[PDB]
């Protein structure tokens, strides 16, 4: 199957540059185009430009000429985009997407690479339990969670029991605090009877600070 694997989230200072990558697999790299798209504030989509891997030629949205430079490494079937002279306006999620020579639109998209531009340094999160109690119990259901506090920049991902617990999980969008740091929580509802027997661990991934935290959450 077609897969487009992009590089992880980035933090960069204003004025700096970053190179992001898209490793393509499951198809013949040079038979298709590679496009790059910017999504700002989780909403507006803008087309940056494209490259035809067979010869490395590229075509740009003039708005992004000199902001973005597209290249490819045909050996590893990887496409790259360099973003130069970063400013806060460049903070966004960047997608690579496969196109065709036959008007097919963008038929497969990469996972997206968040880039945050800031003079502030990265900081990994503190993780605290949201412990189940009688005040988080109701008719044989209990809620528990973890509070993921004071990290920078976005994003953080959270799983429970290494992905084996998904039913009833809610992971909230982060809020930006007055301190300039983010926080979020992730909660799950589980059967009250399981609290004495079942282990619940939240797994918190913060790639920008190269940190992962596992936190066991217990009653009381």
């Amino acid at each position: 199957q077609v897969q487009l694997q992009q590089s992880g989230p980035e933090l960069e200072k204003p004025g700096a540059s970053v190179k992001i990558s898209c490793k393509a697999s499951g198809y013949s790299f040079t038979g298709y185009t590679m496009n790059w798209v910017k999504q700002s504030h989780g909403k507006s989509l803008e087309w940056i430009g494209l490259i035809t891997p067979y010869n490395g030629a590229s075509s740009y949205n003039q708005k992004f000429r000199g902001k973005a430079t597209l290249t490819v490494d045909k050996s590893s079937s990887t496409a790259y985009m360099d973003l130069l002279s970063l400013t806060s306006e460049d903070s966004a999620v960047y997608f690579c997407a496969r196109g065709g020579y036959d008007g097919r639109g963008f038929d497969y998209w990469g996972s997206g690479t968040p880039v945050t531009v800031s003079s502030a340094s990265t900081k990994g999160p503190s993780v605290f339990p949201l412990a189940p109690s009688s005040k988080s119990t109701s008719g044989g259901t209990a809620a528990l969670g973890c509070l993921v506090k004071d990290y920078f920049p976005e994003p953080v991902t959270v799983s429970w029991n290494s992905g084996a617990l998904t039913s009833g999980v809610h992971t909230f969008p982060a809020v930006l605090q007055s301190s300039g740091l983010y926080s979020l929580s992730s909660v799950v509802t589980v059967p009250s009877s399981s609290l004495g027997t079942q282990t619940y661990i939240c797994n918190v991934n913060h790639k920008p600070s190269n940190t992962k935290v596992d936190k066991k959450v217990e009653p009381k």
């Binding site: 605290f128 339990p129 109690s133 005040k135 988080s136 119990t137 259901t141 969670g145």
Partner: peptide
């Protein structure tokens, strides 16, 4: 909504 409340952890 079902409503639940969580005190701060001693650790925090």
């Amino acid at each position: 909504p079902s409503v639940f409340i969580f005190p701060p952890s001693d650790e925090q």
